[PDB]
Amino acid sequence: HKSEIAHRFNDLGEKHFKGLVLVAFSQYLQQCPFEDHVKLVNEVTEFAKKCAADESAENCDKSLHTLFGDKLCTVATLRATYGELADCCEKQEPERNECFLTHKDDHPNLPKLKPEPDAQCAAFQEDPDKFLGKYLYEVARRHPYFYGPELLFHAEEYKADFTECCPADDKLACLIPKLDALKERILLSSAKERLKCSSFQNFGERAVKAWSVARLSQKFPKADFAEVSKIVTDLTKVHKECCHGDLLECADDRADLAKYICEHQDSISGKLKACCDKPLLQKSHCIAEVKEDDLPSDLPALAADFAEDKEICKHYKDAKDVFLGTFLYEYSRRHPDYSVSLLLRIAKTYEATLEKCCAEADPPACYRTVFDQFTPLVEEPKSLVKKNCDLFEEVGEYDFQNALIVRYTKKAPQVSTPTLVEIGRTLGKVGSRCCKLPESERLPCSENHLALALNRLCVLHEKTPVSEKITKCCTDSLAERRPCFSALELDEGYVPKEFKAETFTFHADICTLPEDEKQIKKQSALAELVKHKPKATKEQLKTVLGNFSAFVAKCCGREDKEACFAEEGPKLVASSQLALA
């Protein structure tokens, strides 16, 4: 292309071009204000228009990285606010772009997005474009690896809520649940896409391909190998581009990929009918979250080819990655009931068997029982899901969350209480989302969502490294992560935390808080109890936190609330030390 910026501007249209450019800038520069980002967008969009007029003009021949990166470096107060990104600005490309990605702050800890109905409806009415602009800006900076196109989709959902609710009767009760539901759907899409980007960063491109081969095979079992090969290759290119900042290239390839999938929807999946009769961004979102197609009756038996055949060791050694890819494709089609990580574990086990058996004297008899090696890999996570769902349905989300906070604070007591609480709470959501489902779907739901929860923990752990055991689980193997985390126990090497009185000191302010904010306060205390008494049984801790909850409920209903906390607080905390012995 003679001018790439004009090419993208022409293809994407002005609205999406502007939107995606804003997101791109908002992700790299979290701290800068909205007013500043708008002008950068405006300036770029103008330049793109100039190039679209005359492609052989001054600087129009330059690459997107060059143009975007130069514009990033013009920003006012860049060295003061972003010392890291100012060091990058001196470099040429691609070194400078590579520098920018390294220094994206994976968590800035900005204020939580509190919906303000009246003021937002006011801003929505006066200028809806600038209002959606703020949505893009605010979400993008809170999630530096969010997918541009998918974020544009959630902006239309966001807008749809404000059109339905601002002229309507009660502004609070209309928006609040819709913007809570939207924020839940924002967190999940962010988590899914952060796993893909983390997988490139930590494990490389082959790990993303393998995950994608497995997931897509499950979703499109009717699709032949060549169609899946196309989709994976192209989808991996889309994901690689979005993760490495190339949002304009990502949007173009994503749309082209969704276009291909729908042109060939007959032969790929019956479930794509609804998705293909929809507009651009809606269509792509539907394909990505499409339900798995029903099992074809004519799925081939695999023992003949992958277990019984006499020349497997020959076929493996010719093209290892091709033979395993095929196995993975075929074995994933026939198992929607397995999780993605389980299928990759099974594939790694299959590889390992061939590596071993094709060194031995009689290979066929060795690898003849290769499928039976999978049994223990399948049974472990099945009964872990049953055990956790049995517990979840007994005690509910709050106590299930508490059971996991205890479980993980023991595994990693050196990790910060806010992190431990967050991860434990997210793991408890897996209980809510998966245990209600039909029992066949529990395993894939659980482990796939655990991959999101655990990658989040691993991302936070890069930011604040603490435990060597977590580093190992997070970095040794993508497929073995969840089993690795499960295999952790309390290390005796941890020195029990010293009993500061202020750590378990509650006051009247808790009573005014909402339900989840009360819980987080108690759950922070729960984690602090495990840090002080590592060896306390989970059953001891449950007793003690019950006494905390009661104490909170009691003093919140007292005449003099603060007098109750001041009086009963120290008494509870003193007797709690003894009860955890």
Ligand X SMILES: CCCCCCCCC(=O)O
Q: Which of residues 431-450 bind ligand NBO (CB under 6 A)?
A: 431, 434-435, 446, 450
Is residue 214 at the binding interface for ligand NBO, with CB under 6 A as the rule?
no
CA dist 365 and 388 (Å) reads 39
Q: How far is the CB of 480 from ligand X (least distance, A)?
A: 7
Closest CA to 147 of 23, 257, 259: 23
C-beta of residue 255 within 8 angstroms of C-beta of residue 280? yes
Q: Is position 402 an interface residue for ligand NBO (rule: CB under 6 A)?
A: yes
Please give the Cα distance from 178 to 172 (Å, whole number). 10
406 touches ligand NBO by CB under 6 A: yes
11 is in an annotated binding site: yes
- DSSP letters of 230-246? HHHHHHHHHHHHHHTT-
Helix ranges, 127-224 (H)? 128-142, 148-165, 171-203, 205-219
Is 256 annotated to bind a ligand? Reply is yes
Which CB, 330 or 422, lies closer to ligand X? Answer: 330
Q: Is 399 one of the binding residues for ligand NBO (CB under 6 A)?
A: yes
- Please identify, among the stretches 202-210, 380-388, 417-425, 552-560, the one whose residues bind ligand NBO according to the rule CB under 6 A: 380-388
Rounded Cα distance, 189 and 146, in Å: 8
Is 241 annotated in a binding site? The answer is yes
Shortest CB 7 distance to ligand NBO, Å:
46
With H, G, I as helix, E, B as strand and everything else as coil, classify residue 211.
helix
For the CB of residue 235, give the shortest distance to ligand X in the complex, in Å. Answer: 16
CB 307 within 8 A of CB 367: yes
Please provide residue 240's backbone torsions phi and psi, each rounded to the nearest 5 degrees: -55, -40
Q: What is the Cα 486 distance to its own chain's centre?
A: 19
Known binding residue 1? Answer is yes
Q: Does 542 bind ligand NBO (CB under 6 A)?
A: yes
Give the one entry of ligand NBO, ligand X, none that residue 210 binds, where binding means its C-beta sits below a cut-off of 5 to 8 angstroms depending on kind.
ligand X
Q: Which residues bind ligand X (CB under 6 A)?
A: 203, 207, 210, 324-325, 328, 344, 347-348, 477-479
Q: Which does residue 203 touch among ligand NBO, ligand X, none (CB within 5 to 8 A, set by kind)?
A: ligand X
- 509 marked ligand binding residue: no
Q: Is the peptide bond before 94 cis (omega within 30 degrees of 0)?
A: yes
From 32, 344, 541, 573, residue interacting with ligand NBO (rule: CB under 6 A) = 541
Which of ligand NBO, ligand X, none has residue 40 at its interface (CB below 5 to 8 Å by kind)?
Answer: none
Determine the 3-state secondary structure of 381 from DSSP. helix
Dist CA 287 CA 214 (whole Å): 16
Tell me the helices (H) and strands (E) count for the chain, helix number first. 30, 0
3-state secondary structure of 544: helix
**Burial (0-12, 13-18, 19+ Cβ within 10 Å), 315:** middle
CA angle 154, 158, 160 (to 5 degrees): 115
Q: Which is nearer to ligand NBO, 238 or 541 (CB)?
A: 541
Q: If residue 101 lies in a helix (H) or strand (E), which one and from where to where?
A: helix 95-102
> Which span sits near ligand NBO by CB under 6 A: 154-162, 171-179, 389-397, 570-578?
389-397
| Structure tokens given for 133 | 């602009």
| 163, HSE (Cβ side, Cα atoms, 13 Å) | 9
Taken in order 352, 354, 360, 363, the sign of the CA dihedral is positive
Of 388 and 477, the one with the shorter C-beta distance to ligand X is 477
Q: Is 37 annotated as a binding residue?
A: no
Q: Is 246 annotated to bind ligand?
A: yes
Tell me whether residue 344 or residue 457 sits nearer to ligand X (CB atom).
344
Q: Smallest distance, Å, CB 166 to ligand NBO?
A: 38
Q: Which is nearer to ligand NBO, 45 or 486 (CB)?
A: 486
Region 464-523 residues binding ligand NBO, contact defined as CB under 6 A: 485-486
**CA-to-CA distance for 485 and 538, rounded, in angstroms?**
18
Rank residues 24 and 427 by Cβ distance to ligand NBO and give the closer one: 427
Nearest distance, CB of residue 101 and ligand X, angstroms: 21
Using a 10 angstrom Cβ sphere, with 0-12 exposed, 13-18 middle and 19 or more buried, the burial of residue 545 is buried
Among ligand NBO, ligand X, none, the one that 402 touches (CB under a kind-dependent 5 to 8 A) is ligand NBO
Minimum CB distance to ligand NBO, residue 522 (Å): 8
> At closest approach, how far in Å is the CB of 401 from ligand NBO?
9
Give the integer Cα–Cα distance in Å for 197 and 459: 11
Annotated binding-site ranges for Zn(2+)? 65, 244, 246
Known binding-site residues equal 1, 4, 11, 65, 241, 244, 246, 249, 252, 256
Residue list for the binding site for Ca(2+): 4, 11, 241, 246, 249, 252, 256
Footprint of ligand NBO on this chain (CB under 6 A)? Answer: 384-385, 388-389, 391, 395, 399, 402-403, 406-407, 427, 430-431, 434-435, 446, 450, 485-486, 538-539, 541-542, 545-546
